[PDB]
């Protein structure tokens, strides 16, 4: 399988190609294929895929909001089983940030 | 399944986050904030989920009316297709 899943790996791809790697499907697309989250079964129904691409609403306003700018997010460092706490966050105007603590703090990395 | 939030004992917004955690058997890494509850609700939690929030207006004043925005996240989650029943007692 074709996998790109690290903070630098996905960050550089988003900057260069303005698109997420192909190993990412949204929650919705995954739910359709048979993913039920509490079973921790992403790898059985979508091997090689990670959750990524979904809109991030930036509910605690920790990230720079501005009119016209949408945020989105994706899982980093996932292979199998239950999801972890690492995420990348990218904007429509390509700001990139990351979190390793299940969204408590966010670091700008590009 | 059946989780009961008593809005009398909800001292603060952190109090709430700890209760949601033990009551919905949220991840040990849980970030205790709204972005984190959204992800736990759309990507961790077992369904069907039925949430009973007793005594919501008390909850609101105590939580400087921030209980409303965590009520909004369960509604949004439910509009996305999550099997959540909210019972405002």
UniProtKB/Swiss-Prot annotation, chain A:
Disulfide bonds: none
Uses in biotechnology: Introduced by genetic manipulation and expressed in male sterile maize and rape by Plant Genetic Systems and in radicchio rosso by Bejo Zaden. Barnase expressed in transgenic plants will specifically destroy the tissue(s) where it is expressed. After cell transformation, protein expression and plant regeneration, the active nuclease destroys the pollen producing organs thus rendering the plant sterile.
Active-site residues, record numbering mapped to chain: 73 (proton acceptor), 102 (proton donor)
EC number: 3.1.27.-
Keywords for the protein's UniProt record, in alphabetical order: Endonuclease, Genetically modified food, Hydrolase, Nuclease, Secreted, Signal
Highest taxon of source: Bacteria
Known function: Hydrolyzes phosphodiester bonds in RNA, poly- and oligoribonucleotides resulting in 3'-nucleoside monophosphates via 2',3'-cyclophosphate intermediates.
UniProt name for this protein: Ribonuclease
Organism of this sequence: Bacillus amyloliquefaciens
Lineage, opening ranks: Bacteria, Bacillati, Bacillota, Bacilli, Bacillales
Swiss-Prot record, chain B:
Main location: cytoplasm
Signal peptide range in chain numbering: none
Keywords per UniProt: Cytoplasm
Superkingdom of origin: Bacteria
Pfam families: Barstar
Coiled-coil ranges from the UniProt annotation: none
Localization of this protein: Cytoplasm
Listed GO CC annotations: cytoplasm
Known role: Inhibitor of the ribonuclease barnase. Forms a one-to-one non-covalent complex.
Homology family: Belongs to the barstar family.
Descriptive protein name: Barstar
Organism listed in the record: Bacillus amyloliquefaciens (Bacillus velezensis)
């Amino acid at each position: 399988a074709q996998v790109i899943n690290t903070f630098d790996g996905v960050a550089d791809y988003l900057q260069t190609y303005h698109k997420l790697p192909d190993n990412y499907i949204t929650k919705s697309e995954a739910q359709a294929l048979g993913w039920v989250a509490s079973k921790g079964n992403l790898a059985d129904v979508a091997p090689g895929k990670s959750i990524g691409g979904d809109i991030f609403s930036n509910r605690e306003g920790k990230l720079p909001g501005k009119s016209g700018r949408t945020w989105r997010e994706a899982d980093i460092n996932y292979t199998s089983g239950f999801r972890n706490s690492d995420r990348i966050l990218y904007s429509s105007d390509w700001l990139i940030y990351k979190t390793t603590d299940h969204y408590q703090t966010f670091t700008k990395i590009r | 399944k059946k989780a009961v939030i008593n809005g009398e004992q909800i001292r603060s917004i952190s109090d709430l986050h700890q209760t949601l955690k033990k009551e919905l058997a949220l991840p040990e890494y849980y970030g205790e904030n709204l972005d984190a509850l959204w992800d736990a609700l759309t990507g961790w939690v077992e369904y069907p989920l039925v949430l009973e929030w007793r005594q919501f207006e008390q909850s609101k004043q105590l939580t400087e009316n921030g209980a409303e925005s965590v009520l909004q996240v369960f509604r949004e989650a439910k509009a996305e297709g999550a099997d959540i029943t909210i019972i405002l007692s």
